[PDB]
């Protein structure tokens, strides 16, 4: 049976496992002719997984310097082939030897926010924002990665609330919202930004209630005054300590102001990627600098 448009994965030479994804194993590999390094991610009861189709559809749509690049799909089983990326923000941050200057942290956040602006502009929610899903190439280019939980959106939506790792999950979802949008990814941008200094996830709950409590102990408490209409689905005395609790690690006024505008409770009052990119944090000294 002829197959012009699906190459055999044998074109790539498997070098080393580097994990096991949702549908199979993950390999680092080498193009047999050029040496180009790539990642091969292998793909039940209902034929080809609808979840994998969705991811593929989304990867094929998204083409941008700060979004991971699906090169092609290969047969043998099936493999998604990606340009290989050595590092990931979670790894670099959990490494004491690794050190960012204020200038580079600025650059990282700039690329990340620029990726988000692009994916949202294309009607995609990433839905799995976390340090480990942010990749950095040997050449210091940040890529949003792992779109396996991503989803197209539009404009009374009933999207799934089983979205986003708990520590990065925004208030809306924890309160049971199903008509959510791009602001959920930005809340995650917030948690990651803060993580650039604290070197550790600011809010590490154990259950949704613990998460909602933790969020209140940082961002003040969920109040219809603070968050118009929130009472439609906790603590009561908590007061905003976002700038106080992070005051230690961050120090720079602008960084703290932007993080404060990212970790905003009402999704509708939470800053968007476009305005975030415009924030003085990216336009004051030391200006953003390249990674090495």
């Amino acid at each position: 049976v002829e197959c012009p448009f699906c190459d055999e994965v044998s074109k790539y030479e498997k070098l080393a496992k580097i994990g096991q994804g949702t549908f199979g194993e993950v390999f680092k590999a080498r193009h047999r002719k050029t040496g180009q390094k790539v990642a091969l991610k292998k793909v039940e009861k209902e034929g080809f997984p609808i979840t994998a189709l969705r991811e593929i559809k989304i990867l094929q749509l998204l083409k941008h310097e700060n979004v991971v690049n699906l090169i092609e799909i290969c047969r043998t089983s099936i493999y998604l082939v990606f340009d290989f990326c050595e590092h990931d923000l979670a790894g670099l941050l959990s490494n004491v030897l690794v050190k960012f200057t204020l200038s580079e942290i600025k650059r990282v956040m700039q690329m990340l926010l620029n990726g988000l602006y692009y994916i949202h502009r294309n009607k995609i929610l990433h839905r799995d924002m976390k340090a480990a899903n942010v990749l950095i190439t040997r050449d210091g280019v940040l890529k949003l990665a792992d779109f396996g939980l991503a989803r197209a959106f539009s404009l009374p939506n009933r999207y799934t609330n089983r979205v986003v790792t708990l520590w990065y999950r925004p208030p809306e979802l924890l309160l049971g919202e199903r008509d959510y949008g791009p602001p959920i990814d930005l809340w995650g941008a917030g948690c990651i930004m803060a993580e650039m200094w604290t070197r550790s996830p600011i809010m590490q709950g154990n259950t949704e209630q613990h998460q909602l409590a933790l969020i209140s102990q940082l961002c003040g408490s969920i109040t219809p005054e603070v968050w118009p209409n929130v009472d439609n689905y906790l603590v009561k005395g908590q007061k905003r300590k976002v700038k106080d609790r992070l005051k230690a690690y961050v120090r720079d006024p602008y960084a703290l102001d932007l993080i404060d505008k990212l970790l905003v409770l009402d999704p509708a009052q939470r800053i968007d990627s476009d305005d975030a990119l415009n924030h003085d944090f990216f336009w004051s000294d030391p200006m953003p600098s390249d990674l090495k």
């Binding site: 002829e2 699906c6 209902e46 034929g47 080809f48 609808i50 593929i56 094929q60 749509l61």
Partner: protein, 255 residues
């Protein structure tokens, strides 16, 4: 979409030298095999309660699939169900495997009765579909995002304030162009959309007024499009429509 841009658009000579042609299927036979697959897709889709969009998507899959594979190796009656099963997943209206198999069977064998869902013969047809879905995915090189003419018709027929009648007749043209022609393998969706609007206007004796700029309506839809091509393509579509029993009746003004 895993592309490139003209991979799935073919010249008439490329349409002549099709995979099926290589195995001795006449041109006319092949057109028929395509029309029967599209009909089966429409029958199944209606019964499964998927959208016309999903059916349309499956029809493009089928059309493209047979620019690579031969009807002599893969019968339409096997590819259609797998194509539809795939398209329902892709379009966010997933239908269960057993469900598509049951409906395919009643459409193809109205007088027969589904085998026992425990039999080896039934377990095997469930597996044959899965295998065929996989062959389709690989033939299309996993390019599953389809643009349809309907999207561009809707845009135009509103931005020219056409009667419900005119817009409905255009959508009808668009859908039938998938069943009856290989336009989807030759012309872009905005072009196909122009063909459908044009014919709908001629059929309804409607004229869309020239824009203030002196631009014809189609120039706002696709810049490549010319009146010559429109008239050539409408005549082709009208001819196959006239050969399709009862089809024109659906849009015929009987008053």
């Amino acid at each position: 979409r895993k592309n490139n841009n003209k991979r799935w658009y073919f010249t008439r000579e490329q349409l002549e030298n099709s995979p099926s042609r290589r195995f001795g299927v006449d041109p006319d036979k092949e057109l028929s095999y395509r029309q029967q697959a599209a009909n089966l897709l429409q029958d199944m889709g209606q019964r499964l309660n998927v959208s016309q969009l999903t059916i349309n998507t499956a029809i493009v899959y089928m059309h493209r699939f047979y620019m690579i594979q031969s009807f002599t190796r893969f019968p339409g009656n096997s590819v259609a169900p797998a194509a539809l099963f795939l398209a329902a997943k892709v379009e966010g209206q997933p239908k269960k495997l057993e469900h598509v198999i049951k409906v395919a069977h009643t459409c193809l064998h109205p007088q027969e009765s589904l085998p026992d869902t425990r039999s080896e013969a039934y377990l095997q047809q469930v597996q044959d579909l899965v295998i065929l879905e996989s062959i389709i995915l690989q033939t299309l090189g996993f390019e599953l995002t389809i643009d349809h003419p309907h999207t561009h018709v809707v845009k135009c027929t509103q931005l020219v304030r056409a009667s419900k009648d005119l817009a409905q007749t255009s959508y009808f043209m668009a859908t039938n162009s998938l069943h009856l022609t290989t336009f989807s393998l030759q012309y872009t969706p905005p072009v196909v959309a122009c063909v459908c609007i044009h014919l709908a206007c001629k059929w309804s004796n409607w004229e869309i007024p020239v824009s203030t700029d002196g631009k014809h309506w189609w120039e706002y839809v696709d810049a490549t499009v010319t009146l010559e091509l429109l008239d050539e393509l409408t005549h082709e579509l009208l001819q196959i429509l006239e050969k399709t029993p009862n089809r024109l009746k659906r849009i015929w003004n009987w008053r």
